[PDB]
Write a protein that holds these residues in place. Structure first.
Motif, PDB file in Angstrom:
ATOM      1  N   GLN A 104       0.889  -1.232  -0.031  1.00 19.59           N
ATOM      2  CA  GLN A 104       0.153  -0.180   0.130  1.00 19.59           C
ATOM      3  C   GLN A 104       0.952   1.171   0.086  1.00 19.59           C
ATOM      4  OE1 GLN A 104      -3.601   1.899   2.825  1.00 19.59           O
ATOM      5  NE2 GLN A 104      -3.337  -0.653   2.834  1.00 19.59           N
ATOM      6  N   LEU A 105       0.785   2.126  -0.857  1.00 20.76           N
ATOM      7  CA  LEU A 105       1.482   3.395  -0.973  1.00 20.76           C
ATOM      8  C   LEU A 105       0.997   4.463  -0.233  1.00 20.76           C
ATOM      9  CD1 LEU A 105       2.199   2.973  -4.706  1.00 20.76           C
ATOM     10  CD2 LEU A 105       3.070   1.844  -2.809  1.00 20.76           C
ATOM     11  N   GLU A 106       1.633   5.263   0.645  1.00 16.51           N
ATOM     12  CA  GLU A 106       1.147   6.207   1.583  1.00 16.51           C
ATOM     13  C   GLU A 106       1.737   7.592   0.840  1.00 16.51           C
ATOM     14  OE1 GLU A 106       3.346   5.331   5.089  1.00 16.51           O
ATOM     15  OE2 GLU A 106       2.116   3.670   5.698  1.00 16.51           O
ATOM     16  N   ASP A 107       0.639   8.618   0.949  1.00 14.59           N
ATOM     17  CA  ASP A 107       0.802   9.948   0.140  1.00 14.59           C
ATOM     18  C   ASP A 107       2.147  10.702   0.462  1.00 14.59           C
ATOM     19  OD1 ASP A 107      -2.480  10.864  -0.320  1.00 14.59           O
ATOM     20  OD2 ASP A 107      -1.762   8.847   0.221  1.00 14.59           O
ATOM     21  N   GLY A 108       2.613  10.560   1.589  1.00  6.34           N
ATOM     22  CA  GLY A 108       3.654  11.323   1.946  1.00  6.34           C
ATOM     23  C   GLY A 108       5.097  10.733   1.600  1.00  6.34           C
ATOM     24  N   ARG A 109       4.977   9.423   1.345  1.00  5.39           N
ATOM     25  CA  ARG A 109       6.349   8.653   0.861  1.00  5.39           C
ATOM     26  C   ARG A 109       6.627   8.808  -0.555  1.00  5.39           C
ATOM     27  NH1 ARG A 109       7.473   9.290   5.170  1.00  5.39           N
ATOM     28  NH2 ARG A 109       7.321   7.657   6.930  1.00  5.39           N
ATOM     29  N   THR A 110       7.692   8.588  -1.199  1.00  4.90           N
ATOM     30  CA  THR A 110       8.320   8.841  -2.432  1.00  4.90           C
ATOM     31  C   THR A 110       8.435   7.413  -3.287  1.00  4.90           C
ATOM     32  OG1 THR A 110      10.752   8.653  -2.188  1.00  4.90           O
ATOM     33  CG2 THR A 110       9.656  10.658  -1.622  1.00  4.90           C
ATOM     34  N   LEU A 111       8.238   7.476  -4.663  1.00  6.64           N
ATOM     35  CA  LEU A 111       8.416   6.289  -5.493  1.00  6.64           C
ATOM     36  C   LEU A 111       9.656   5.487  -5.043  1.00  6.64           C
ATOM     37  CD1 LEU A 111       7.240   7.968  -8.728  1.00  6.64           C
ATOM     38  CD2 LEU A 111       5.727   6.467  -7.224  1.00  6.64           C
ATOM     39  N   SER A 112      10.598   6.111  -5.004  1.00  6.48           N
ATOM     40  CA  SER A 112      11.928   5.430  -4.722  1.00  6.48           C
ATOM     41  C   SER A 112      11.961   4.469  -3.319  1.00  6.48           C
ATOM     42  CB  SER A 112      13.287   6.624  -4.760  1.00  6.48           C
ATOM     43  OG  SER A 112      12.773   7.649  -3.712  1.00  6.48           O
ATOM     44  N   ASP A 113      11.080   5.253  -2.300  1.00 10.59           N
ATOM     45  CA  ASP A 113      11.114   4.523  -0.976  1.00 10.59           C
ATOM     46  C   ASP A 113      10.211   3.258  -1.213  1.00 10.59           C
ATOM     47  OD1 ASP A 113      10.021   7.669   0.732  1.00 10.59           O
ATOM     48  OD2 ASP A 113      11.708   6.495   0.550  1.00 10.59           O
ATOM     49  N   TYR A 114       9.708   2.945  -2.439  1.00  8.42           N
ATOM     50  CA  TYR A 114       9.052   1.629  -2.611  1.00  8.42           C
ATOM     51  C   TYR A 114       9.673   0.951  -3.638  1.00  8.42           C
ATOM     52  CZ  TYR A 114       4.941   3.567  -0.010  1.00  8.42           C
ATOM     53  OH  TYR A 114       4.298   4.350   0.986  1.00  8.42           O
ATOM     54  N   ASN A 115      10.891   1.219  -4.052  1.00 12.06           N
ATOM     55  CA  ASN A 115      11.520   0.489  -5.351  1.00 12.06           C
ATOM     56  C   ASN A 115      10.793   0.765  -6.555  1.00 12.06           C
ATOM     57  OD1 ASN A 115      14.229   0.275  -4.229  1.00 12.06           O
ATOM     58  ND2 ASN A 115      13.695  -2.144  -4.054  1.00 12.06           N
ATOM     59  N   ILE A 116       9.906   1.486  -6.797  1.00 12.37           N
ATOM     60  CA  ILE A 116       9.301   1.775  -8.104  1.00 12.37           C
ATOM     61  C   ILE A 116      10.272   2.405  -9.075  1.00 12.37           C
ATOM     62  CG2 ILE A 116       7.765   3.017  -9.025  1.00 12.37           C
ATOM     63  CD1 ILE A 116       6.031   2.908  -6.445  1.00 12.37           C
ATOM     64  N   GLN A 117      10.456   1.367 -10.277  1.00  5.31           N
ATOM     65  CA  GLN A 117      11.386   1.736 -11.437  1.00  5.31           C
ATOM     66  C   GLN A 117      10.669   1.973 -12.759  1.00  5.31           C
ATOM     67  OE1 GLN A 117      13.610  -1.685 -10.919  1.00  5.31           O
ATOM     68  NE2 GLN A 117      12.513  -2.568 -12.439  1.00  5.31           N
ATOM     69  N   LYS A 118      11.414   1.966 -13.626  1.00  3.50           N
ATOM     70  CA  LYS A 118      10.867   2.507 -15.178  1.00  3.50           C
ATOM     71  C   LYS A 118      10.073   1.282 -15.583  1.00  3.50           C
ATOM     72  CE  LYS A 118      14.625   0.244 -17.693  1.00  3.50           C
ATOM     73  NZ  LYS A 118      14.149  -1.321 -17.997  1.00  3.50           N
ATOM     74  N   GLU A 119       8.794   1.473 -15.855  1.00  3.12           N
ATOM     75  CA  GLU A 119       7.705   0.584 -16.355  1.00  3.12           C
ATOM     76  C   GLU A 119       7.140  -0.150 -15.086  1.00  3.12           C
ATOM     77  OE1 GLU A 119       7.453   0.070 -20.251  1.00  3.12           O
ATOM     78  OE2 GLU A 119       9.314   1.211 -20.912  1.00  3.12           O
ATOM     79  N   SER A 120       7.415   0.133 -14.288  1.00  2.07           N
ATOM     80  CA  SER A 120       6.691  -0.245 -12.794  1.00  2.07           C
ATOM     81  C   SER A 120       5.051   0.171 -13.145  1.00  2.07           C
ATOM     82  CB  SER A 120       6.967   0.258 -11.717  1.00  2.07           C
ATOM     83  OG  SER A 120       8.319  -0.183 -11.118  1.00  2.07           O
ATOM     84  N   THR A 121       4.232  -0.809 -12.754  1.00  2.00           N
ATOM     85  CA  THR A 121       2.967  -0.737 -12.721  1.00  2.00           C
ATOM     86  C   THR A 121       2.225  -0.572 -11.339  1.00  2.00           C
ATOM     87  OG1 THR A 121       2.699  -2.098 -14.867  1.00  2.00           O
ATOM     88  CG2 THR A 121       0.639  -1.669 -13.664  1.00  2.00           C
ATOM     89  N   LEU A 122       1.571   0.542 -11.031  1.00  2.00           N
ATOM     90  CA  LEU A 122       0.737   0.827 -10.009  1.00  2.00           C
ATOM     91  C   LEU A 122      -0.645   0.478 -10.102  1.00  2.00           C
ATOM     92  CD1 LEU A 122       2.171   4.108  -8.590  1.00  2.00           C
ATOM     93  CD2 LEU A 122       3.465   1.824  -8.899  1.00  2.00           C
TER      94      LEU A 122
END
Ligand SMILES: [Cl-]
Length: 71
Positions: free
Chosen positions: A49-67
């Motif tokens: 679950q992604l939290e509003d105040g965190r960043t994409l890099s905090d979650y290891n979201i990378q190029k062509e990642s799908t949310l």
């Protein structure tokens, strides 16, 4: 950084973001694309679950990642 967001109907939104963009910033981009109010958006990446105040890099979201938008 290009990422994909799937809406609750499976429609794909393509977004351009920076690695340290917050989930709040991503929610604003989805609002612009599709009109979905940020306070109704809940986003998941790889089951996390992604939290509003965190960043994409905090979650290891990378190029062509799908949310996913979820209930
Ligand atoms: Cl910013």
């Amino acid at each position: 950084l290009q990422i994909f967001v799937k809406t609750l109907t499976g429609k794909t939104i393509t977004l351009e973001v920076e690695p340290s963009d917050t989930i709040e910033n991503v929610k604003a981009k989805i609002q612009d694309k599709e009109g979905i109010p940020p306070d109704q958006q809940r986003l998941i990446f790889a089951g996390k679950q992604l939290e509003d105040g965190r960043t994409l890099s905090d979650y290891n979201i990378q190029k062509e990642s799908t949310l996913h938008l979820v209930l």
